[PDB]
């Protein structure tokens, strides 16, 4: 569900919503499967929210993503992809340099559609 709205909702509303959930996601960023699922979702929402424009804490959270992939059950690989895609997003404006660190008739017709009430 969410990604459709996130990728399409008004950019101004994106500012409002993200600013509303900055620390709401900062803390939760850091059985266990549920943890992993929530973390996928967090990466999948942060990456898309990054895609527009660069609060004061905004500096740090970047790093907290990269390490997530760096781990050396398939849900774990899905998690790796989640973190890596989120990093790929956030690396757009930051490290913009190299070294990324891997009518009459119409109205009457509608009036009659109204009369039958069915289009």
Partner 1 sequence: NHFWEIVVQDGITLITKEEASGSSVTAEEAKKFLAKDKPSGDTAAVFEEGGDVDDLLDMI
Which positions lie near partner 1, rule CB under 8 A? Answer: 54, 56, 58-60, 62-63, 94-95, 99, 101
Residue 94's nearest CA partner among 71, 67, 60 is 60
Reduce the DSSP state of residue 62 to 3 states and report it. helix
Q: How far is the CB of 99 from partner 1 (least distance, A)?
A: 7
Q: How far apart are CA 47 and CA 3, in angstroms?
A: 10
Residue 58 or 110: which CB sits closer to partner 1? 58
- In the structure encoding, which two tokens stand for residue 72, read together? 């050396």
Q: How far is the CB of 57 from partner 1 (least distance, A)?
A: 9
Residue 7 or 95: which CB sits closer to partner 1? 95
Q: Which residue has the tokens 């979702």?
A: 41
Angle 61-64-70 from CA coordinates, rounded to 5°: 155
Residue 95 or 114: which CB sits closer to partner 1? 95
Q: How far is the CB of 53 from partner 1 (least distance, A)?
A: 10
């Amino acid at each position: 569900s969410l990604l459709t709205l996130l990728w399409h909702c008004s950019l101004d509303a994106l500012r409002e919503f993200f600013s509303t959930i900055v620390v709401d996601a900062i803390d939760v960023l850091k059985t266990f499967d549920t943890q992993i699922t929530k973390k996928m979702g967090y990466y999948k929402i942060l990456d898309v929210m990054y895609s527009r424009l660069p609060n004061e804490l905004t500096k740090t959270l970047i790093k907290l993503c990269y390490d997530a992939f760096t781990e050396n059950l398939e849900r774990r690989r899905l998690y790796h992809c989640a973190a890596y895609n989120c990093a790929i997003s956030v690396i757009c404006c930051v490290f913009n340099e190299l070294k990324f660190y891997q009518s009459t008739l119409s109205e009457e017709m509608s009036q009659f559609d109204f009369s039958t009430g069915v289009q």
